[PDB]
Amino acid sequence: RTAVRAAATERDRFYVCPPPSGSTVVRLEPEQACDMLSRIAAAWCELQNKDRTLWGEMSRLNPSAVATAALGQRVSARMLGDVMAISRCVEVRGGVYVQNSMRVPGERGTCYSRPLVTFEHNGTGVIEGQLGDDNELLISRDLIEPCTGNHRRYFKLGGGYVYYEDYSYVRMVEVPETISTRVTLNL
C-alpha cells in the first residue's frame, strides 16, 4: 500500500531531536536540606529528596525524558559520565504523512517496528524518517522486525493515536479508556 494518511496535532507537537554535542551540559538539583504548616514543608522537602533518588536512576537510562520534564520542554539528552548534554528538539510543521504499510519494500518477509513517516521541513527539504516514541520523529528508517502474524499496535500519532493491523494501516483512533495513578485531592 503505497498510500500515506496525512496528519496534524495540536499542543502535542511533533518534534525531531538532533544528537546533542556538549554545547550545554547540566546536572540535577540534588537533595536540599529542610506550626501545622511547618510539618507540611518538612515532609514535602523529604519527599522531593527521596523522589530525587528515583529521578537519578531514570536519568541514567532515559535522560531525554528527565530533561523534558525538568525543563517542561521537548529535549534530546544523553549522559557524559555523571552529567547530561542537551539540545532543544525542533518542532515540525509541514505535512506529516504516515505510510500505510509497515512492510519493508524489497525484503518481503521483514517489516518495520513502527510506522514509516514522510515529512518536510526541519532545516530543510523532505525527510524519510519513522515514528518515534511519543512524537519523536526519527530521521532513520531502521526499526525493523520480521513479520509476525497477529501484529496489532497502537502508536501515538501526534494528538491522537493510530491503529495498525497485520503490519498495515487501519484508521485513526482516540484511545477512550484512560487509566491513572493520578491522586486528586478534594478541595
Epitope: 524489497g106 518481503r108 518477509g109 521483514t110 525493523i144 509476525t148 497477529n150
Partner: antibody, heavy 119, light 108 residues
C-alpha cells in the same frame, strides 16, 4: 503451477559441511520469502531458516545459528542452505518452503541428510 | 520460545464421522495459527491459516477454530484420503514452532 525442487543431501561425517539448493519455478521469485524446514527421523518439523524476498535479511533458531547460512539468488530463482559444524542430530529430511506473507505455504519435495559411519 | 503442545499423538475415528484436534500455544497468538496435512509418503500441505480460514484448494469438511491459546482443527465427515499426520504451527513469534503432530485412523 508453483513448483519446487531441492537437492544436496546424502551422508556426512560429523563436524562436516554441506550446501543444499532449491530450484523455484512457477511464481515471481523475489515477491516471496523463502524458508527451510526439517523433519526429524519421525516428526517435529524444526524450522531451520527463513530469508527475505530481496536477500537482505534472514532469521534463525538459536539451535542452528552460526552453523547454518541461508542465502538466495534471484537471477535464476534458487535458494541455498549452507550447513557447517554439521552435527549428528541435523540428520533429517529437508523441505525447502515458500512463505505467503508470514509462514510456509507450498512445501517442497523433501531432501534427506544423514551422519557418521559408512556405506 | 512459544512452545506449542499438540496432544494427542494418536486419534482414531470412523468413516464419514466427526473429528477434531487440539493445539495449546503457551502465550497468546490470537488469530495466527496454522494446520498442515501430511499424507503418508508426501511432504506437508498447507490447510488452514490465521486460524479457521482455508487455503485455496482444501475441501470444506475441514474447519479450524478458536484463538488466544486454544486452537482446534475439526473435520466434518471423514473420507479415505483424510487419514494422514496432522501438524499445527504458530506464527506470532520467531522462533517458529510446530506441534508434535497427531495421527489419524479409520475404523473398518
Amino acid at each position: 503451477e508453483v513448483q519446487l525442487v531441492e537437492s544436496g543431501g546424502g551422508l556426512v561425517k560429523p563436524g562436516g559441511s554441506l550446501k543444499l539448493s532449491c530450484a523455484a519455478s512457477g511464481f515471481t521469485f523475489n515477491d516471496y520469502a523463502m524458508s527451510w524446514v526439517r523433519q526429524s527421523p519421525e516428526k517435529r518439523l524444526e524450522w531451520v531458516a527463513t530469508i527475505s524476498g530481496g536477500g537482505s535479511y534472514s532469521y534463525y533458531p538459536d539451535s542452528v545459528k552460526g552453523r547454518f547460512t541461508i542465502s538466495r539468488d534471484n537471477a535464476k530463482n534458487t535458494l541455498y542452505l549452507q550447513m557447517s559444524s554439521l552435527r549428528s542430530d541435523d540428520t533429517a529430511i529437508y523441505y525447502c518452503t515458500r512463505q505467503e506473507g508470514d509462514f510456509p505455504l507450498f512445501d517442497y519435495w523433501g531432501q534427506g541428510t544423514i551422519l557418521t559411519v559408512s556405506s | 520460545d512459544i512452545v506449542v503442545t499438540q496432544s494427542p499423538k494418536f486419534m482414531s475415528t470412523s468413516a464419514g464421522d466427526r473429528v477434531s484436534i487440539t493445539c495449546k500455544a503457551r502465550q497468546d497468538v490470537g488469530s495466527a495459527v496454522n494446520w498442515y496435512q501430511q499424507k503418508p509418503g508426501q511432504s506437508p500441505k498447507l490447510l488452514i491459516y490465521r486460524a479457521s480460514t482455508r487455503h485455496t484448494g482444501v475441501p470444506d469438511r475441514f474447519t479450524g477454530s478458536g484463538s488466544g491459546t486454544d486452537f482446534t482443527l475439526t473435520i466434518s465427515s471423514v473420507q479415505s484420503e483424510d487419514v494422514a499426520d496432522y501438524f499445527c504451527q504458530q506464527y506470532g513469534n520467531y522462533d517458529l514452532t510446530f506441534g508434535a503432530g497427531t495421527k489419524l485412523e479409520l475404523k473398518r
